[model samples]
Target chain A: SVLEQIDQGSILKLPSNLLFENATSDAINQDMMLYIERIAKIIQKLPKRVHINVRGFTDDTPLVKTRFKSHYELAANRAYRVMKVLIQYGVNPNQLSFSSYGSTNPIAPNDSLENRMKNNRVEIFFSTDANDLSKIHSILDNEFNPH
Target chain B: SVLEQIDQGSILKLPSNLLFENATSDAINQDMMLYIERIAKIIQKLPKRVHINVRGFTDDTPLVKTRFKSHYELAANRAYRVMKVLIQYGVNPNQLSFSSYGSTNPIAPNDSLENRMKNNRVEIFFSTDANDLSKIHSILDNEFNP
Candidate 1:
C-alpha cells in the first residue's frame, strides 16, 4: 500500500542534470525545488515509522584548486544542503541522514565531459526503523569496496 | 593520558546561557562563539577515533505558534546548530551525533522562571566507541526520569 502511493503518484526522482548549475558550485537549481516539494508530500503521507536518506555523488574529476577538500566533501555538502532545505519545509531532521558516494560509484563513464557531469547527482531514499544509525559506518565499510 | 587531554583539558562543558538569542531564535550568540572556537581546537587535537555528541536540553516552556512544533525540535536544533559550526571548522561530520532532551530532563526544579531558564542548556561530550554511546544513552534514559 505504501509502495503503491509512492510508485503510482507524484513523487519523482531528483533530476541529476540540474542539481549543480556548474561544476564548481554546490547550489541546487530552481528545478530541483519541485522534487523537494514532491518528496516532502511523500514524507508527510508515508507511515510515521518511515525514515529517509539523502545520498550524494560526484564524478572522478579531482577537485584541485577548489574550496572543497575532495570529491567526497563536495558530494556530502550537496546532500547536506538539500537536507537543510527539507528541514526548512518541516521534515523532521531526526528522520533523515546524510551520505556521500564521492567519485567512487559512477553510473556513467568519465570519457566525456557531459557523461562526467551525469555522474554528479543526489538521491533521496526511504527507509524503516531497521536502518540503525550506529550501523552506518559498517554499511560504509561495505560500500567503500573498490576494484 | 587520553582523559587528561580531553575529559580534563579540552572537554569543557557548554554554558547554559547564551546558547540562543531568545527562546525562539536558533542563532548562536557572540558568547557561544567562544565555545565553538575552543571546541574546534579540541576536535582537531583529538584523534580521528574520538567521537563527539552534542546533547541539548530545555525547560518546561511550551513553544506554541512558533516555527518549532515542540521542545524536542527546539532542543535538537540547538545541538545541530553547534555541530554544524564544528563541521565548518573542519571537524569530520561523521564523527558527531546530535541529541536532545527537550523538557523531560531538568537539572533544576522548574519552580520559578529563573529556575526554568536554568534547565535550558546544551552539553558536548566525547566517547571512543559504540560501547560508549549505548552507555551514554543508558545514563540519559535514567536522567530523564522526571
Candidate 2:
C-alpha cells in the first residue's frame, strides 16, 4: 500500500510508526518484523537485477538521551537494521544496500509533530541495471543501419 | 547529452571536470557557465510545478590547503553555485533547491583517479508534484462507484 511508482522505478515509504517503537533506538517491534517479512517475500519475487537501497531519514529535532551522537548515525543504524531484516528474510544481500540521509531530504517541513513524523521515515528505492536502453539502441540500429 | 531518464523524471549528471576550475573552490569555469546556461534554458521551458534539485558529490580525498573542513561543505557549495546559475538564467528560484551527498554515494570506487573523477560529479534531479494520482483516483471512482 505504501508502494509508489516513479519514473526510475518504485519507492516504498515505510513510516517510523510502522517500524520502530520510538526514535531512541533501531530496534523494530514484533509487528514491524512481520511487516518486513512480507516485504522481503515480495522483493524476492522481483528480478535479480533489480537493486534496492534502504534509505533512512530523520527530522531536524535534536537528540535527547539517545546513544547516537548525530542524526546521521541514528539514521544509518535504522537503515542497516532494516536491510539486515530483509537479508534474514531471504532477499539477496548483493541486491541490497543502505544509505542515511539524516535530516536532509525531509518530505515535510519539521514544523509540527505530524510533519516531523512524516520526515522521520524510511524509503526503499528500487532501480535496475537491466539494459532497457540497449534494447532501444538495438531497435534504432535496425531502423537506421539496416544492411 | 548527460541527461538520463528515470521513473520519476530525468537526471542530468555533470562531471566535475565540466564544472570547476579545480577542487579547491566552488567557482564554476567559463565553459561550465555556458553549459549551465544551456541547461537553464531547458529547465525554463518545463512546467512551473516541476522541481529541480541540484545535488553535489565528492571523492573521499581529504582537503589539503582548502578552507573547507569536510567534503560536505565543499559539495554543498558546489551544488549551491550550480543552483544559483540556473536561477540567474531565468529558471524560477521557487522550483529550485540543492543537496550535498559529499563523499557518500560514489558512482564508482575511490581507488583510482578516473573513478574519483566520476564520483565528484553533480546531478540535477527533475521531479514534479503534479496530480496524476488524483486523475487515477477520479477514474477509479467512476469505474467502481458509478
Candidate 3:
C-alpha cells in the first residue's frame, strides 16, 4: 500500500480547499494564498505518479429548501479550487478528476445542520507508483544519515 | 450627522488599504471562477459607488515577519473578482475604490482563532447614492425576498 512506506504523512492530512470556505477574495490578502502555495510545494516532492480523486457529498436538503446553489456546485467548486492550486504548483490536470454525489451520500443525518455541514465535503483519494516509496527512502537515507 | 446615522455602532477603527497587502501585481482571478456569480448577484444594485470591507486578524505567523511585495496585485485580483460579479449583475467600476490594513488596523485581538478570523475580512464601506440604495433594497426585499 502507498501508505505503508511513505516517509511523510503531512500531505495526507494537509487542509486544502476546505480552508478557503469563507475567506474573502482581496488582493491585500495573500496569507492563505501562500499557505496554498506551501501545500503545492510538498506534493511535488513525492517522486511518484499519483491519481487524485475529488469525491463530493451533500446534505439531503430538498431542492426547494436549499440556501446554496445545489450542493454539487459547492463540492465541485471546492474541487476546482484545489485542482487549480495543485496545477499552478506543477500538478498535471490529467492526473486529477472530480465527481459530485449531490445529496445522495450522507455520512450523517442530514436532518441536522451540524450533520449537513459535516456531510458537505470532498474526500481525496490517491495511489502513487509502488516503487517510488523505496526510491524516496533510499534518497533520504543517503542524503541524511539513516540512523 | 451622517456618522450618527449609521445603523451599526461606531468604533475607533483605523484606516485599512485592503487590496495592497497580498501580491506584487494588480491582476485578479477571472469571474465565474468561484462564487463570483453568486456574490455579484447579491450586490448587483447600486447608483454610482459601492464599497465593502472585510476584517481579518491573524497571529505573528509566517506573514508577520515578511513584508508583502505587492498589495497592488492583491487589490487588482480582488477587484477583478468583485468587478466580474458586480458588472455582470449591474455595478459599474467607475464608482469603486478599496483599501486594506493587514495588521496595520485590526478590530479584534490576535490571541484567539475566532477573534483573528473575525478580524480577517473585506467590507463594502461605500455604496452608491441613496437612489441606488433604495433600488438595491427593493430588489433584495421583493425580488429576492428570503
Candidate 3 ranges with C-alpha deviation above 4 Å: A1-18, A22-31, A62-69, A128-147, B1-146
TM-score of 3: 0.34
Q: Each prediction's TM-score against the native? A: 0.43, 0.54, 0.34
Of the pair 1 and 2, which is ahead by lDDT?
A: 2
Model 2: per-residue lDDT, tens digit, A5-113? 6545678988666688787578898776888888999997898878787877888899876888777657766876787799899988657756566676688989999
RMSD of each: 14.7, 7.0, 23.3
How do the residues B14-59 of candidate 3 rate in per-residue lDDT, one tens digit apiece? Answer: 1122323432323334432344355445555533334432222222
lDDT score of residue A23 within candidate 1: 65
Best of the two (2, 3) by DockQ: 2
lDDT (tens digit, per residue) of candidate 1 on A81-145: 77768877878765765555567557788889988987887777564433244356446767896
Model 3 whole-model lDDT (C-alpha atoms):
0.42
**DockQ: which is higher, 1 or 2?**
2
Lowest lDDT sum, 10 consecutive residues, model 3 chain A, at A1-10
Candidate 3 at residue A134, lDDT?
Answer: 52
Q: Provide the DockQ value for model 2.
A: 0.09
